[PDB]
Enzyme design. Structure first.
Site, PDB file in Angstrom:
ATOM      1  N   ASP A 124      16.219  61.836  -1.118  1.00 25.59           N
ATOM      2  CA  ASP A 124      14.909  62.518  -1.301  1.00 25.59           C
ATOM      3  C   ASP A 124      14.616  62.671  -0.475  1.00 25.59           C
ATOM      4  O   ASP A 124      13.934  61.931   0.277  1.00 25.59           O
ATOM      5  CB  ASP A 124      13.894  62.133  -2.303  1.00 25.59           C
ATOM      6  CG  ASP A 124      12.859  63.356  -3.083  1.00 25.59           C
ATOM      7  OD1 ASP A 124      12.442  64.337  -3.558  1.00 25.59           O
ATOM      8  OD2 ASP A 124      11.518  63.001  -2.075  1.00 25.59           O
ATOM      9  N   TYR A 164       7.672  64.281   6.381  1.00 26.59           N
ATOM     10  CA  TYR A 164       8.158  63.126   6.761  1.00 26.59           C
ATOM     11  C   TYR A 164       8.650  62.548   7.284  1.00 26.59           C
ATOM     12  O   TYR A 164       8.502  61.320   7.895  1.00 26.59           O
ATOM     13  CB  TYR A 164       9.198  62.401   4.898  1.00 26.59           C
ATOM     14  CG  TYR A 164       8.832  62.478   3.687  1.00 26.59           C
ATOM     15  CD1 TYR A 164       7.669  63.023   3.583  1.00 26.59           C
ATOM     16  CD2 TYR A 164       9.838  62.747   2.869  1.00 26.59           C
ATOM     17  CE1 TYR A 164       7.502  63.377   1.959  1.00 26.59           C
ATOM     18  CE2 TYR A 164       9.436  62.681   1.468  1.00 26.59           C
ATOM     19  CZ  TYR A 164       8.479  62.940   1.178  1.00 26.59           C
ATOM     20  OH  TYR A 164       8.161  63.339  -0.382  1.00 26.59           O
ATOM     21  N   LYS A 183      12.035  69.558   0.611  1.00 30.29           N
ATOM     22  CA  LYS A 183      10.819  70.614   0.156  1.00 30.29           C
ATOM     23  C   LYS A 183       9.800  71.403   1.613  1.00 30.29           C
ATOM     24  O   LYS A 183      10.297  70.555   2.688  1.00 30.29           O
ATOM     25  CB  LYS A 183      10.185  69.441  -0.410  1.00 30.29           C
ATOM     26  CG  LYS A 183      10.699  68.013  -1.128  1.00 30.29           C
ATOM     27  CD  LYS A 183       9.342  67.241  -1.803  1.00 30.29           C
ATOM     28  CE  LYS A 183       9.560  65.999  -2.321  1.00 30.29           C
ATOM     29  NZ  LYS A 183      10.325  64.287  -1.573  1.00 30.29           N
ATOM     30  N   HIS A 201       6.892  71.307  -2.182  1.00 34.28           N
ATOM     31  CA  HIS A 201       6.393  70.364  -2.045  1.00 34.28           C
ATOM     32  C   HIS A 201       4.875  70.442  -2.520  1.00 34.28           C
ATOM     33  O   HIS A 201       4.814  69.446  -3.695  1.00 34.28           O
ATOM     34  CB  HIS A 201       6.317  70.033  -0.606  1.00 34.28           C
ATOM     35  CG  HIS A 201       6.045  68.498  -0.482  1.00 34.28           C
ATOM     36  ND1 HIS A 201       6.843  67.821   0.304  1.00 34.28           N
ATOM     37  CD2 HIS A 201       6.040  67.279  -0.757  1.00 34.28           C
ATOM     38  CE1 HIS A 201       6.150  66.644   0.708  1.00 34.28           C
ATOM     39  NE2 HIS A 201       6.261  66.345  -0.764  1.00 34.28           N
TER      40      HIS A 201
HETATM   41  N1  NAP Z   1       7.060  65.267  -4.524  1.00 33.17           N
HETATM   42  C1  NAP Z   1       6.242  64.790  -3.477  1.00 33.17           C
HETATM   43  O1  NAP Z   1       4.662  65.406  -3.368  1.00 33.17           O
HETATM   44  C2  NAP Z   1       6.007  62.893  -3.557  1.00 33.17           C
HETATM   45  C3  NAP Z   1       5.131  61.954  -3.366  1.00 33.17           C
HETATM   46  C4  NAP Z   1       5.024  61.008  -3.432  1.00 33.17           C
HETATM   47  C5  NAP Z   1       6.551  60.225  -3.070  1.00 33.17           C
HETATM   48  N2  NAP Z   1       7.612  61.353  -3.568  1.00 33.17           N
HETATM   49  C6  NAP Z   1       8.803  60.416  -3.253  1.00 33.17           C
HETATM   50  O2  NAP Z   1       8.943  59.672  -3.839  1.00 33.17           O
HETATM   51  C7  NAP Z   1      10.049  58.178  -3.271  1.00 33.17           C
HETATM   52  C8  NAP Z   1       9.586  57.303  -4.253  1.00 33.17           C
HETATM   53  O3  NAP Z   1       7.869  57.123  -3.921  1.00 33.17           O
HETATM   54  P1  NAP Z   1       7.348  56.366  -2.880  1.00 33.17           P
HETATM   55  O4  NAP Z   1       7.690  56.183  -1.502  1.00 33.17           O
HETATM   56  O5  NAP Z   1       5.822  56.787  -3.365  1.00 33.17           O
HETATM   57  O6  NAP Z   1       7.068  55.044  -3.964  1.00 33.17           O
HETATM   58  P2  NAP Z   1       8.032  53.732  -4.889  1.00 33.17           P
HETATM   59  O7  NAP Z   1       9.312  54.338  -4.587  1.00 33.17           O
HETATM   60  O8  NAP Z   1       6.750  54.169  -6.280  1.00 33.17           O
HETATM   61  O9  NAP Z   1       7.164  52.498  -3.772  1.00 33.17           O
HETATM   62  C9  NAP Z   1       8.147  52.084  -2.455  1.00 33.17           C
HETATM   63  C10 NAP Z   1       7.778  50.888  -2.636  1.00 33.17           C
HETATM   64  O10 NAP Z   1       8.352  49.745  -3.013  1.00 33.17           O
HETATM   65  C11 NAP Z   1       9.066  48.669  -2.175  1.00 33.17           C
HETATM   66  N3  NAP Z   1      10.077  48.998  -3.181  1.00 33.17           N
HETATM   67  C12 NAP Z   1      11.397  49.329  -3.230  1.00 33.17           C
HETATM   68  N4  NAP Z   1      11.764  48.834  -3.968  1.00 33.17           N
HETATM   69  C13 NAP Z   1      11.541  47.301  -4.218  1.00 33.17           C
HETATM   70  C14 NAP Z   1      11.862  46.585  -5.093  1.00 33.17           C
HETATM   71  N5  NAP Z   1      12.829  46.087  -5.661  1.00 33.17           N
HETATM   72  N6  NAP Z   1      11.166  45.293  -4.982  1.00 33.17           N
HETATM   73  C15 NAP Z   1       9.698  45.399  -4.646  1.00 33.17           C
HETATM   74  N7  NAP Z   1       9.303  45.867  -3.798  1.00 33.17           N
HETATM   75  C16 NAP Z   1      10.057  47.638  -3.780  1.00 33.17           C
HETATM   76  C17 NAP Z   1       9.345  49.490  -0.540  1.00 33.17           C
HETATM   77  O11 NAP Z   1       8.463  48.614  -0.093  1.00 33.17           O
HETATM   78  P3  NAP Z   1       9.951  48.541   0.904  1.00 33.17           P
HETATM   79  O12 NAP Z   1      10.572  49.968   1.777  1.00 33.17           O
HETATM   80  O13 NAP Z   1       9.477  47.772   2.265  1.00 33.17           O
HETATM   81  O14 NAP Z   1      11.437  47.558   0.545  1.00 33.17           O
HETATM   82  C18 NAP Z   1       8.154  50.287  -0.789  1.00 33.17           C
HETATM   83  O15 NAP Z   1       6.820  49.820  -0.024  1.00 33.17           O
HETATM   84  C19 NAP Z   1       9.333  59.115  -2.067  1.00 33.17           C
HETATM   85  O16 NAP Z   1       9.718  58.254  -0.921  1.00 33.17           O
HETATM   86  C20 NAP Z   1       9.053  60.049  -1.953  1.00 33.17           C
HETATM   87  O17 NAP Z   1      10.891  60.581  -1.549  1.00 33.17           O
HETATM   88  C21 NAP Z   1       7.512  63.024  -3.608  1.00 33.17           C
END
Ligand code: NAP
Length: 316
Positions: A44, A49, A78, A111
């Site tokens: 994704d 980004y 997006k 997006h």
């Molecule tokens: N459409 C939208 O508007 C939108 C908005 C938000 C997000 N998104 C998408 O959704 C994705 C995921 O959401 P997000 O990036 O907000 O957050 P997330 O996936 O909920 O959390 C990411 C965080 O969790 C940590 N982490 C990952 N695996 C872990 C594990 N096994 N144990 C402990 N900590 C762990 C990562 O650390 P490290 O990376 O340091 O390992 C990072 O700090 C985004 O990257 C993006 O692609 C889309």
């Protein structure tokens, strides 16, 4: 648990993907290479980004290495808010394609429903700090998305951060040519989303859950905020199943027929996070996780709360 879900364009989408928001450009090439090596087939992405070039280097290298075939990957990006105008959608898509080293995207999302004034700045501001809107509406932007399908640039189109009335507006669009395939929304035990999920699934729209771990690296995090990965109630479910808390948080949306896109740039966690196809949460576990809802958002787009198309005034 099958690995792919069938979309309303007839293609199959992997239910687990790798997120890339906040992945540093100097780390994300190796993160995506590792992810593909350990089984991920869905990435994704987004232009906002600012790391699509580096994601693309990984994809291209794994295609050249013949680790995977292009048909086996499912790459999502997006359209950012400053490109909602008819005349800018194709070039925005093509910039993303060029950066990602691709000749097509598997899925391209609007997006956010909010269009902003075009220009260099991703969040254009008036003097008093409000984001400056575009007058282009969701429906004309959707027609521009449909043209990308008909030009072969994208296999599927969808939406992100659309509330149910906005999904309905798309579905009720005069002359609608392609229904949205996906609505990508925030979803986790603190923002469980039953109505919006229930509505999209009833219409054949697949839901992708973003921030499934509660985005601990989100830039606006406050110490007092709730923390999924530290919640002792969720840690207990994980201990019962001999899994990590993150693995429970990833399996949860999978058992709701959602796609889920946890982000990591840590190799061990990237591999960790994929090892979720070998255990089942009980119905009681699922209901218990759902009971933790409190309508808490990572992503509330706070600079845009007076835009006409701001999505989160509506109950859902
Ligand atoms: N459409 C939208 O508007 C939108 C908005 C938000 C997000 N998104 C998408 O959704 C994705 C995921 O959401 P997000 O990036 O907000 O957050 P997330 O996936 O909920 O959390 C990411 C965080 O969790 C940590 N982490 C990952 N695996 C872990 C594990 N096994 N144990 C402990 N900590 C762990 C990562 O650390 P490290 O990376 O340091 O390992 C990072 O700090 C985004 O990257 C993006 O692609 C889309």
């Amino acid at each position: 648990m099958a690995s792919r879900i069938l979309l309303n364009n007839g293609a199959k989408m992997p239910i687990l993907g790798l997120g890339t928001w906040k992945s540093p450009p100097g780390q994300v090439t190796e993160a995506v290479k590792v992810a593909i090596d350990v089984g991920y087939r869905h990435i994704d992405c987004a232009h906002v980004y600012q790391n699509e070039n580096e994601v693309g280097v990984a994809i291209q290298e794994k295609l050249r290495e013949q680790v995977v075939k292009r048909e086996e990957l499912f790459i999502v990006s997006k359209l950012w808010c400053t490109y909602h105008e008819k005349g800018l959608v194709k070039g925005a898509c093509q910039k993303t394609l060029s950066d990602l080293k691709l000749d097509y995207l598997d899925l391209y999302l609007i997006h956010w429903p909010t269009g902003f004034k075009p220009g260099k700045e991703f969040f254009p501001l008036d003097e008093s700090g409000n984001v400056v809107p575009s007058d282009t509406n969701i429906l004309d932007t959707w027609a521009a998305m449909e043209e990308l399908v008909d030009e072969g640039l994208v296999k599927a189109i969808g939406i992100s951060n659309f509330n149910h009335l906005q999904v309905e507006m798309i579905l009720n669009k005069p002359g609608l040519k392609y229904k949205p395939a996906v609505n990508q929304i925030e979803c986790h035990p603190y923002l469980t989303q039953e109505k919006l999920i229930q509505y999209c699934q009833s219409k054949g729209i697949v839901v992708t859950a973003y921030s499934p771990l509660g985005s601990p690296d989100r830039p606006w995090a406050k110490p007092e905020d709730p923390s999924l990965l530290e919640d002792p109630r969720i840690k207990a479910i994980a201990a019962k199943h001999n899994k990590t808390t993150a693995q429970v948080l990833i399996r949860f949306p999978m058992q709701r027929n959602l796609v889920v896109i946890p982000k990591s740039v840590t190799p061990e966690r990237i591999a960790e996070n994929f090892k979720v196809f070998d255990f089942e949460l009980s119905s009681q576990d699922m209901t218990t996780l759902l009971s933790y809802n409190r309508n808490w958002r990572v992503c509330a787009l706070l600079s845009c709360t007076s835009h006409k198309d701001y999505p989160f005034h509506e109950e859902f």
